[PDB]
Amino acid sequence: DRINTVRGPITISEAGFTLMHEHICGSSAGFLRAWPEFFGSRDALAEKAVRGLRRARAAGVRTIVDVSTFDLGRDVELLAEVSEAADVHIVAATGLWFDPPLSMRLRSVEELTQFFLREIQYGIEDTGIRAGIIKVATTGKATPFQERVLRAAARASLATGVPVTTHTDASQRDGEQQADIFESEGLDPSRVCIGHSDDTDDLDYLTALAARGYLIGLDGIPWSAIGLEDNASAAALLGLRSWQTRALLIKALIDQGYADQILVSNDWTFGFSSYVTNIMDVMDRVNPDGMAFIPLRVIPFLREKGVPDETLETIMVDNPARFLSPT
Amino acid sequence: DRINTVRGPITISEAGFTLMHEHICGSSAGFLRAWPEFFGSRDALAEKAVRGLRRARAAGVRTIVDVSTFDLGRDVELLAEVSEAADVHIVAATGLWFDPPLSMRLRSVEELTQFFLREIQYGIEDTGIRAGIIKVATTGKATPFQERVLRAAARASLATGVPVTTHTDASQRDGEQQADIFESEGLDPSRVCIGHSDDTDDLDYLTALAARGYLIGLDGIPWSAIGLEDNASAAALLGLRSWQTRALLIKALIDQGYADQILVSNDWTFGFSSYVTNIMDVMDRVNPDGMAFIPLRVIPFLREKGVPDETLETIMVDNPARFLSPTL
Ligand SMILES: C[As](C)(=O)[O-]
Ligand SMILES: C[As](C)(=O)[O-]
Ligand SMILES: [Zn+2]
Ligand SMILES: [Zn+2]
Ligand SMILES: [Zn+2]
Ligand SMILES: [Zn+2]
């Protein structure tokens, strides 16, 4: 009973404190190999990752799930290099985000299913590294292609037991349509995390989903453009709600009885080519702690607001363990 | 004077009979490495490309220019492998086609220039293989991003002497806007080929660009869905004009005195993931000669219509040599 990481199978107990939604680098397929100098160099990007992951490890983190797909420019050799150097387990993702190229965009459910199965069952590219999660996306009402991806993801997950995690536009309650399609396909909600759910203050939306058995991805806690409201690009990406506001959703879902179903993350990165230039310097200003932000700031904050230690252990250790374990 | 190929620099005279607009595999960045099974396997794609290239070489072809960009999933290692096994030179391209991912789409003119220069001056990825041509695209009126690509292409060309070749929607006369943007950047028209110009029967349009010194890319001669019109995807790709109708545009431009500005090609490929599934099968049934189509079918057609052998030699040998030669 194992979880696949970029360095091979680990037992469930080796996962430990897990960040369920992160990135080493948010990019585009082939981009890091073709234009490494965009990040200074490949090795500069690798060293910055290792630095961050090592700080994160010292704050308690033992595993990250990199939910970078093919079209987010996932580079599993990079993941494996920084994973070994930082001694942090990394889980790699299959699926598709919202920038699929034509060779993906034009594919059928059946073809998309073969591709996801391949990255899980056989390996990514020629590396033998197998994905341990499936990432999907909608950005409002699903496009016909995005529906095809949701159905292919559900099928790959039913075939392998590997779970599904999603990008939503939470302001458009995208989780509801994602849920309806997963349920028509036959996927159990306990195998699905509806992500970016911390982008909304609509508790009605989040409890309805948790009521139906979905894990709830509160995965962007440090994302805030408060204090640089005249950077339009950064305000659009990070929002104008505080990290405290986002984190209090964690407490709120615990008070409604759903601690079992929460997954907490930073949605951090060491490189971000698929947004405006120098966004990574803006982000690093806003949250200097990077991936360490959850353990160093958010856990202590929840403790101080009356959340018991056993509860936080369950969210940061047991919820990720149950979710990632294939079933 | 030298041209960069996927096996290093060659002299002008080694290029010989050159197809200026071809593909080994039309795809998407990273796609061939992530999902080789789409093409059967990497081995099966290479086998088919080497066979098709040896077929082309036996008909007289010595060089092709693969105008597959980054976002067309150009794999220069595949290009090196098949170039060498078939003993046909391949010129690799930089630039961007019309499926740029976000990491390209959001870049400034300056950033794109630096990217194109990297692939010409240094190499593609970590291979040391340098691009010998810059490929760009509009599909209608230029988007803001495509405008930035054209300007970045002009600046890369000006700095390196490497020529620019374009994708157009010919039916919307894109080459007119492409020309204005390039000229606004001070690029000489003789460094520019306006491609897919055989997709239109608009001689007024084509002769006006030729008059301004542009090279005219008649690059899809075997492309035709006549006979299989009820295949809607193939019809939209290949069109409802015969290969002979396309080839007669070559004769038309020669007749108007523009033999020196014509570039003829097949726009062929050995895999095509960035269109509908099994399109390769439709295309191969239409044109089984693949890249040998120009020398075995089009050159004898134009001879029978009274075009002199010396003019066909100019168009297939001299025009490419002059266009590909880096010239500042
Ligand atoms: C790469 As993201 C902003 O969708 O987590
Ligand atoms: C790859 As094409 C059909 O624009 O030559
Ligand atoms: Zn997302
Ligand atoms: Zn993310
Ligand atoms: Zn084209
Ligand atoms: Zn082409």
XYZ file of C-alpha atoms and ligand atoms in Angstrom:
669
model
C 0.000 0.000 0.000
C 2.250 2.732 -1.406
C 2.272 6.336 -2.695
C 4.320 7.098 -5.875
C 6.844 9.960 -5.547
C 9.459 11.252 -7.963
C 11.985 8.986 -6.164
C 9.773 5.900 -6.119
C 7.217 4.313 -3.796
C 7.023 5.387 -0.149
C 4.844 3.867 2.601
C 1.906 5.972 3.837
C 3.692 6.783 7.116
C 6.769 8.277 5.424
C 4.484 10.976 3.911
C 4.221 12.786 7.265
C 3.281 16.473 7.199
C 2.144 16.969 3.584
C 1.413 20.120 1.542
C -1.245 18.894 -0.920
C -1.099 21.744 -3.530
C 2.313 23.243 -4.455
C 4.558 23.771 -7.494
C 8.329 23.701 -7.977
C 7.768 25.767 -11.144
C 4.629 27.032 -12.867
C 5.529 27.005 -16.520
C 4.540 25.553 -19.923
C 5.417 22.227 -21.541
C 8.994 22.325 -22.877
C 9.541 25.945 -21.649
C 12.104 25.196 -18.927
C 14.197 23.142 -21.379
C 13.907 25.719 -24.216
C 14.328 28.975 -22.212
C 16.037 28.194 -18.855
C 17.597 31.664 -18.763
C 14.091 33.027 -18.133
C 14.644 31.785 -14.514
C 18.319 32.834 -14.554
C 19.255 29.285 -15.350
C 17.986 25.763 -14.716
C 20.524 25.396 -11.908
C 19.547 28.767 -10.351
C 15.906 27.595 -10.276
C 16.919 24.225 -8.785
C 19.067 25.851 -6.035
C 16.204 28.302 -5.120
C 13.789 25.336 -4.857
C 16.211 23.352 -2.666
C 16.725 26.386 -0.424
C 12.955 26.845 0.002
C 12.218 23.171 0.484
C 14.995 22.853 3.066
C 13.476 25.809 5.092
C 10.116 24.121 4.672
C 11.569 20.813 5.913
C 13.070 22.568 8.964
C 9.611 23.969 9.755
C 8.129 20.345 9.729
C 7.116 19.698 6.043
C 8.039 16.122 4.891
C 6.126 15.918 1.554
C 4.768 18.247 -1.119
C 2.399 17.314 -3.886
C 3.431 19.160 -7.028
C 0.178 19.615 -8.924
C 1.959 20.883 -12.024
C 0.547 19.042 -15.086
C 2.073 18.603 -18.565
C 0.686 22.024 -19.618
C 2.068 23.640 -16.424
C 5.498 22.538 -17.714
C 6.058 19.849 -15.087
C 9.667 18.683 -15.329
C 9.997 15.518 -13.292
C 13.793 15.348 -13.514
C 13.858 18.755 -11.837
C 11.379 17.548 -9.217
C 13.516 14.433 -8.503
C 16.784 16.483 -8.254
C 15.346 19.012 -5.778
C 13.451 16.236 -3.892
C 16.709 14.359 -3.208
C 18.750 17.521 -2.465
C 16.173 18.951 0.036
C 15.152 15.504 1.480
C 11.496 16.332 0.881
C 9.273 13.747 -0.828
C 7.555 15.057 -3.969
C 4.437 13.584 -5.561
C 3.995 14.313 -9.282
C 0.769 14.934 -11.073
C -0.840 13.879 -14.365
C -3.961 15.535 -15.882
C -4.249 18.960 -17.561
C -4.524 22.508 -16.281
C -6.167 25.310 -18.328
C -3.448 25.948 -20.957
C -3.565 22.703 -22.995
C -1.939 22.910 -26.438
C -3.704 21.720 -29.636
C -2.278 18.185 -29.414
C -4.204 17.791 -26.118
C -7.202 20.131 -26.802
C -8.274 18.038 -29.784
C -8.227 14.665 -27.946
C -11.200 12.456 -27.067
C -12.146 11.115 -23.619
C -10.643 7.738 -24.615
C -7.317 9.306 -25.750
C -7.125 11.570 -22.691
C -7.761 8.475 -20.519
C -4.838 6.580 -22.207
C -2.573 9.582 -21.510
C -3.459 9.884 -17.797
C -3.186 6.057 -17.349
C 0.237 6.148 -18.991
C 1.679 8.767 -16.623
C 0.276 6.803 -13.624
C 0.838 3.152 -14.627
C 3.894 3.344 -16.892
C 5.715 6.616 -16.177
C 6.156 10.198 -17.216
C 8.034 10.605 -20.493
C 10.941 8.115 -20.438
C 11.758 8.661 -16.734
C 9.828 5.748 -15.139
C 8.548 8.306 -12.608
C 4.829 7.700 -11.962
C 2.230 10.314 -11.018
C 0.425 9.943 -7.699
C -2.374 12.430 -8.343
C -4.533 13.705 -11.234
C -4.953 17.463 -11.688
C -7.888 18.959 -13.620
C -9.256 22.505 -14.109
C -12.275 24.620 -14.955
C -12.423 28.444 -15.079
C -16.106 29.063 -14.901
C -18.544 26.826 -16.713
C -16.529 23.950 -18.147
C -15.539 24.075 -21.752
C -16.430 20.939 -23.753
C -12.754 19.977 -23.626
C -12.557 20.511 -19.875
C -15.580 18.207 -19.419
C -13.722 15.587 -21.459
C -10.714 16.001 -19.115
C -12.957 15.627 -15.973
C -14.398 12.396 -17.355
C -10.974 11.049 -18.373
C -9.638 11.965 -14.905
C -12.520 10.135 -13.187
C -11.860 7.056 -15.313
C -8.112 7.041 -14.651
C -8.803 7.496 -10.894
C -11.386 4.579 -10.843
C -8.844 2.426 -12.743
C -5.818 3.210 -10.500
C -7.224 4.452 -7.197
C -5.104 7.595 -7.529
C -7.023 10.722 -6.417
C -8.183 13.818 -8.324
C -7.446 17.469 -7.283
C -9.002 20.440 -9.144
C -8.496 24.050 -10.053
C -11.649 26.125 -9.630
C -12.813 29.570 -10.148
C -14.409 29.504 -6.694
C -16.247 32.858 -7.295
C -18.237 30.950 -9.975
C -18.832 27.944 -7.671
C -17.085 25.665 -10.226
C -16.934 22.844 -7.652
C -20.680 22.148 -8.158
C -20.377 21.305 -11.866
C -17.138 19.381 -11.262
C -18.954 17.338 -8.578
C -21.946 16.633 -10.829
C -19.718 15.301 -13.584
C -17.574 13.208 -11.203
C -20.767 11.733 -9.662
C -22.342 10.894 -13.083
C -19.058 9.214 -14.004
C -19.130 7.263 -10.694
C -16.145 8.695 -8.788
C -16.469 8.740 -4.969
C -16.167 12.345 -3.575
C -13.635 11.092 -1.044
C -11.252 10.717 -4.042
C -11.732 14.345 -5.065
C -10.343 17.631 -3.692
C -12.009 20.813 -4.920
C -9.097 23.337 -4.894
C -8.759 27.063 -4.586
C -11.781 26.896 -2.326
C -10.144 29.522 -0.056
C -10.621 32.079 -2.976
C -14.269 32.524 -1.789
C -15.927 33.571 1.521
C -19.158 31.657 0.533
C -19.369 29.084 3.382
C -22.705 27.833 1.961
C -20.868 26.698 -1.147
C -18.032 24.970 0.749
C -20.273 23.151 3.318
C -22.589 21.878 0.523
C -19.568 20.351 -1.177
C -18.181 18.936 2.107
C -21.695 17.646 2.893
C -21.505 15.616 -0.317
C -18.103 14.126 0.901
C -15.580 16.271 -1.152
C -12.244 17.267 0.260
C -11.917 21.024 0.306
C -8.715 22.576 -0.884
C -7.812 25.662 1.064
C -4.559 25.857 -0.829
C -3.684 29.597 -1.280
C -3.570 30.845 2.329
C -0.658 33.325 1.870
C -2.055 34.784 -1.379
C -2.819 38.468 -0.832
C -2.144 41.700 -2.697
C -3.059 43.786 0.388
C -0.664 46.741 0.424
C 0.104 46.658 -3.311
C -3.407 47.371 -4.646
C -1.919 49.522 -7.489
C -0.217 46.455 -9.023
C -3.169 45.385 -11.176
C -1.510 42.118 -12.341
C -0.667 41.094 -8.786
C -4.082 42.207 -7.411
C -5.830 40.006 -10.072
C -3.677 36.951 -9.190
C -3.440 37.263 -5.379
C -6.838 38.892 -4.567
C -7.445 41.593 -1.921
C -8.456 39.309 0.956
C -5.889 38.825 3.803
C -4.180 35.540 4.631
C -5.993 35.636 7.990
C -9.351 35.785 6.182
C -8.385 32.742 4.084
C -7.042 30.849 7.131
C -10.247 31.481 9.157
C -12.092 29.367 6.542
C -10.056 26.470 7.934
C -11.454 27.089 11.434
C -14.946 27.621 10.030
C -15.006 24.200 8.253
C -13.684 22.594 11.480
C -16.568 24.284 13.432
C -19.103 22.869 10.949
C -17.671 19.368 11.697
C -15.601 18.850 8.531
C -12.002 18.692 9.802
C -11.846 15.185 8.120
C -12.291 16.782 4.704
C -9.902 19.824 4.727
C -6.670 20.054 2.820
C -4.413 23.027 3.497
C -1.601 24.384 1.296
C 0.367 27.498 0.120
C 0.101 27.032 -3.685
C 3.690 28.268 -3.718
C 6.389 28.016 -6.378
C 10.039 28.803 -7.076
C 9.419 29.815 -10.717
C 6.323 31.219 -12.499
C 6.762 31.728 -16.267
C 3.045 31.295 -17.121
C 2.222 34.706 -15.649
C 3.552 38.274 -15.915
C 7.321 38.745 -15.736
C 8.813 39.168 -12.229
C 5.600 37.891 -10.526
C 7.891 35.626 -8.529
C 9.572 38.715 -6.912
C 6.127 40.144 -6.025
C 5.044 36.821 -4.520
C 8.288 36.390 -2.578
C 7.855 39.937 -1.120
C 4.291 39.119 0.011
C 5.223 35.730 1.589
C 9.020 35.489 2.384
C 8.297 32.219 4.212
C 7.203 30.571 0.935
C 6.203 26.982 1.479
C 7.064 27.273 5.183
C 4.139 29.680 5.573
C 1.590 27.014 6.595
C 3.715 25.466 9.419
C 5.334 28.750 10.650
C 2.323 31.132 10.483
C -0.972 29.415 9.816
C -0.674 26.489 12.281
C 0.297 28.866 15.194
C -2.572 31.218 14.155
C -5.168 28.445 14.237
C -3.765 27.216 17.603
C -4.164 30.717 19.033
C -7.780 30.826 17.707
C -8.568 27.676 19.743
C -7.934 24.891 17.257
C -6.622 21.798 19.088
C -3.230 20.326 18.135
C -4.796 16.889 17.386
C -7.123 18.571 14.867
C -4.219 20.248 13.025
C -2.205 16.996 13.031
C -5.265 15.333 11.404
C -5.487 18.010 8.687
C -1.731 18.190 7.920
C -0.889 14.480 8.248
C -3.823 12.041 8.309
C -6.108 13.775 5.650
C -3.254 13.807 3.060
C -2.334 10.213 3.967
C -5.967 8.942 3.397
C -6.411 11.002 0.248
C -3.137 9.973 -1.493
C -3.334 6.283 -0.575
C -4.758 4.539 -3.715
C -8.276 3.066 -3.124
C 28.973 31.901 -45.819
C 27.122 29.164 -44.006
C 23.659 27.805 -43.221
C 22.967 26.180 -39.836
C 21.530 22.667 -40.021
C 20.648 20.157 -37.318
C 24.084 18.520 -38.092
C 26.012 21.863 -38.052
C 27.053 24.523 -40.627
C 26.926 23.708 -44.358
C 28.039 25.747 -47.392
C 25.500 27.375 -49.710
C 26.311 24.958 -52.459
C 25.636 21.849 -50.211
C 21.944 22.828 -49.803
C 21.125 21.943 -53.432
C 17.471 21.119 -54.180
C 15.711 22.584 -51.109
C 12.117 22.321 -49.800
C 11.621 25.564 -47.858
C 8.411 24.776 -45.856
C 8.206 21.208 -44.435
C 7.782 19.374 -41.110
C 9.089 16.119 -39.660
C 6.311 16.178 -37.094
C 3.619 18.785 -36.428
C 2.940 18.660 -32.738
C 2.956 20.738 -29.515
C 5.859 21.561 -27.139
C 6.818 18.510 -24.971
C 4.137 16.337 -26.635
C 6.336 13.808 -28.477
C 8.397 13.209 -25.311
C 5.284 12.886 -23.038
C 3.102 10.774 -25.330
C 5.106 9.048 -28.062
C 2.396 6.310 -28.306
C 0.138 8.836 -30.045
C 2.430 8.310 -33.054
C 2.677 4.492 -32.449
C 6.069 5.051 -30.865
C 9.102 7.325 -31.286
C 10.799 4.492 -33.233
C 7.842 4.155 -35.609
C 7.719 7.964 -36.268
C 11.495 8.027 -36.978
C 11.149 4.969 -39.315
C 8.394 6.679 -41.307
C 10.265 10.027 -41.485
C 13.521 8.337 -42.599
C 11.600 6.403 -45.288
C 9.816 9.556 -46.470
C 13.071 11.526 -46.520
C 14.932 8.784 -48.485
C 11.971 8.766 -50.945
C 12.353 12.573 -51.297
C 16.164 12.282 -51.650
C 15.807 9.626 -54.445
C 13.650 12.226 -56.342
C 16.433 14.834 -56.075
C 15.717 16.594 -52.700
C 18.918 17.405 -50.730
C 17.675 19.827 -48.026
C 14.403 20.548 -46.194
C 13.678 23.362 -43.885
C 11.566 22.203 -40.953
C 9.491 25.260 -40.004
C 8.248 23.545 -36.823
C 8.626 26.056 -33.970
C 8.726 25.519 -30.217
C 4.911 25.544 -30.034
C 4.721 23.090 -32.955
C 6.647 20.618 -30.739
C 9.893 20.774 -32.745
C 12.169 17.995 -31.431
C 15.661 18.772 -32.796
C 17.030 15.407 -31.629
C 14.472 13.653 -33.834
C 15.422 16.067 -36.650
C 19.202 15.277 -36.191
C 18.476 11.493 -36.108
C 16.404 11.391 -39.329
C 18.553 13.976 -41.161
C 21.569 11.742 -40.608
C 19.922 8.353 -41.370
C 18.285 9.684 -44.649
C 21.302 11.861 -45.626
C 19.083 14.915 -46.195
C 20.067 18.211 -44.564
C 17.436 19.749 -42.235
C 17.342 23.420 -41.310
C 15.655 23.993 -37.941
C 13.425 26.967 -37.116
C 12.935 29.325 -34.201
C 9.975 31.657 -33.820
C 6.311 30.964 -32.820
C 3.385 29.446 -34.695
C -0.230 30.150 -33.608
C -0.451 27.878 -30.489
C 1.916 29.617 -28.030
C 1.418 28.490 -24.436
C 1.008 31.068 -21.616
C 4.761 31.241 -20.875
C 5.277 32.547 -24.456
C 1.918 34.437 -24.876
C 2.665 36.794 -21.963
C 6.192 37.806 -23.041
C 7.137 41.282 -24.341
C 8.716 42.018 -27.741
C 12.140 42.277 -25.937
C 11.763 38.923 -24.258
C 10.701 37.146 -27.458
C 13.655 38.725 -29.305
C 16.063 37.315 -26.708
C 14.381 33.897 -27.041
C 14.687 33.826 -30.860
C 18.322 35.002 -30.662
C 19.093 32.237 -28.180
C 17.974 29.574 -30.630
C 19.930 31.190 -33.563
C 23.156 32.327 -31.766
C 23.572 29.546 -29.134
C 21.287 26.623 -29.791
C 17.973 24.974 -29.173
C 17.514 23.603 -25.611
C 20.811 22.028 -24.504
C 21.661 20.629 -27.953
C 23.931 23.277 -29.543
C 21.703 22.899 -32.668
C 21.169 26.449 -34.077
C 18.082 27.599 -36.021
C 18.626 28.732 -39.647
C 15.229 30.399 -40.077
C 12.558 32.280 -38.023
C 8.905 31.135 -38.366
C 5.917 33.364 -37.406
C 2.108 33.276 -37.938
C -1.001 35.336 -38.211
C -4.499 33.863 -38.674
C -6.360 36.934 -39.818
C -5.696 40.399 -38.530
C -2.701 40.083 -36.175
C -3.477 39.666 -32.454
C -1.457 41.914 -30.163
C 0.777 38.956 -29.295
C 1.324 37.947 -32.960
C 2.320 41.561 -33.682
C 4.961 41.295 -30.932
C 6.178 37.995 -32.475
C 6.553 39.598 -35.939
C 8.509 42.556 -34.477
C 10.697 40.252 -32.394
C 11.273 38.116 -35.553
C 12.302 41.234 -37.548
C 14.750 42.251 -34.780
C 16.282 38.764 -34.575
C 16.641 38.726 -38.403
C 18.230 42.179 -38.453
C 20.781 41.081 -35.824
C 21.694 37.724 -37.380
C 20.891 37.895 -41.130
C 18.687 34.780 -40.746
C 15.452 34.963 -42.848
C 11.815 35.051 -41.656
C 9.057 32.755 -43.053
C 5.354 33.225 -42.224
C 2.105 31.389 -41.765
C -0.853 33.366 -43.270
C -4.542 33.142 -43.626
C -4.157 33.886 -47.334
C -7.928 34.296 -47.757
C -7.688 37.370 -45.459
C -4.524 38.648 -47.235
C -2.466 38.516 -44.005
C 0.768 39.087 -45.899
C -0.182 42.778 -46.392
C -0.240 43.435 -42.624
C 2.797 41.164 -42.078
C 4.716 43.274 -44.640
C 3.737 46.630 -42.994
C 4.808 45.392 -39.531
C 8.156 43.990 -40.822
C 8.884 47.196 -42.844
C 8.013 49.312 -39.764
C 10.885 47.416 -38.070
C 13.263 48.242 -41.035
C 13.537 44.580 -42.236
C 14.222 44.123 -45.968
C 11.413 42.273 -47.759
C 14.027 40.021 -49.430
C 14.530 38.493 -45.948
C 10.811 37.508 -45.748
C 8.728 34.721 -47.261
C 4.918 35.113 -47.036
C 3.800 31.513 -46.683
C 0.720 29.499 -47.521
C 0.270 31.955 -50.427
C -0.982 29.052 -52.614
C -4.086 28.817 -50.382
C -5.537 31.794 -52.351
C -6.091 32.307 -56.121
C -5.604 36.082 -55.624
C -2.850 37.014 -58.072
C -3.294 40.781 -57.467
C -2.433 40.155 -53.796
C 0.545 37.867 -54.591
C 2.031 40.043 -57.416
C 1.790 43.211 -55.187
C 3.904 41.543 -52.438
C 6.367 40.181 -55.021
C 6.621 43.755 -56.484
C 7.672 44.914 -52.985
C 10.486 42.258 -52.950
C 8.852 39.583 -50.775
C 9.372 35.933 -51.414
C 6.092 34.123 -52.024
C 5.732 30.745 -50.395
C 3.697 28.375 -52.573
C 4.151 25.674 -49.974
C 1.082 23.375 -49.954
C 0.847 22.170 -53.594
C -0.367 18.602 -52.853
C -2.968 19.818 -50.306
C -6.467 18.958 -51.598
C -9.668 17.342 -50.195
C -11.226 16.995 -53.704
C -12.614 13.496 -53.802
C -13.233 13.364 -50.032
C -15.237 16.605 -49.482
C -17.673 14.911 -47.100
C -14.773 14.632 -44.553
C -15.351 18.034 -42.979
C -12.106 18.218 -40.970
C -9.976 17.174 -43.963
C -11.803 19.682 -46.224
C -11.219 22.583 -43.810
C -7.465 21.643 -43.575
C -6.661 20.759 -47.199
C -9.228 22.947 -49.116
C -11.328 22.265 -52.266
C -8.720 23.293 -54.903
C -6.733 20.732 -56.946
C -2.958 20.440 -56.638
C -2.773 21.517 -60.313
C -4.698 24.741 -59.468
C -2.109 25.457 -56.770
C 0.827 24.579 -59.104
C -0.509 26.932 -61.805
C 0.069 29.830 -59.370
C 3.794 29.009 -59.800
C 3.455 29.390 -63.572
C 1.350 32.577 -63.025
C 4.051 34.279 -60.974
C 6.777 33.160 -63.381
C 4.730 34.644 -66.243
C 4.494 37.987 -64.356
C 8.308 38.031 -64.080
C 8.657 36.946 -60.428
C 10.499 33.580 -60.860
C 13.241 34.975 -58.523
C 10.797 35.460 -55.652
C 9.036 32.067 -55.641
C 9.590 29.343 -53.045
C 7.837 26.008 -53.624
C 7.176 23.296 -51.111
C 4.838 20.520 -49.937
C 4.187 21.495 -46.245
C 4.327 17.798 -45.592
C 4.831 15.951 -42.282
C 5.323 12.405 -40.897
C 3.139 12.956 -37.782
C 0.466 15.593 -36.954
C -0.864 15.614 -33.381
C -1.959 19.237 -33.479
C -4.980 18.422 -35.716
C -7.734 15.717 -35.609
C -6.817 12.109 -34.865
C -5.784 10.029 -37.953
C -5.366 13.148 -40.214
C -1.912 11.703 -41.204
C -3.752 8.732 -42.707
C -6.040 11.005 -44.745
C -3.045 13.132 -45.855
C -0.919 10.058 -46.817
C -3.786 8.654 -48.916
C -4.057 12.055 -50.679
C -0.294 12.417 -51.314
C 1.630 9.093 -50.891
C 4.713 10.707 -52.489
C 4.982 12.921 -49.370
C 7.935 15.334 -49.811
C 8.814 13.787 -53.191
C 5.570 15.339 -54.562
C 7.197 18.587 -55.750
C 10.083 17.000 -57.728
C 8.125 13.991 -59.107
C 4.688 15.573 -59.843
C 4.897 19.387 -59.825
C 8.208 19.862 -61.743
C 7.012 17.598 -64.693
C 3.577 19.331 -64.645
C 5.193 22.776 -65.015
C 7.567 21.492 -67.751
C 4.564 20.226 -69.744
C 3.024 23.705 -69.348
C 6.145 25.218 -70.981
C 8.141 26.329 -67.952
C 11.868 26.015 -68.804
C 14.096 23.676 -66.774
C 16.461 26.596 -65.962
C 13.563 28.450 -64.294
C 12.654 25.341 -62.230
C 16.352 25.140 -61.247
C 16.354 28.807 -60.138
C 13.228 28.236 -57.991
C 14.180 24.970 -56.284
C 17.994 25.631 -55.917
C 19.025 29.290 -56.290
C 16.106 31.050 -54.559
C 16.479 28.912 -51.388
C 20.288 29.326 -51.387
C 19.938 33.130 -51.599
C 17.089 33.226 -48.997
C 18.777 30.943 -46.426
C 22.216 32.617 -46.715
C 22.473 34.858 -43.624
C 22.529 38.419 -45.050
C 22.454 41.594 -42.923
C -0.756 27.350 -11.245
As -2.298 27.930 -10.165
C -2.429 29.868 -10.039
O -3.720 27.565 -11.040
O -2.409 27.083 -8.659
C 1.748 23.138 -39.436
As 0.835 24.195 -40.823
C -0.778 23.309 -41.451
O 0.358 25.789 -40.325
O 1.946 24.308 -42.128
Zn -4.990 26.475 -9.955
Zn -1.532 25.411 -8.233
Zn 1.239 27.218 -41.410
Zn 3.874 24.277 -42.048
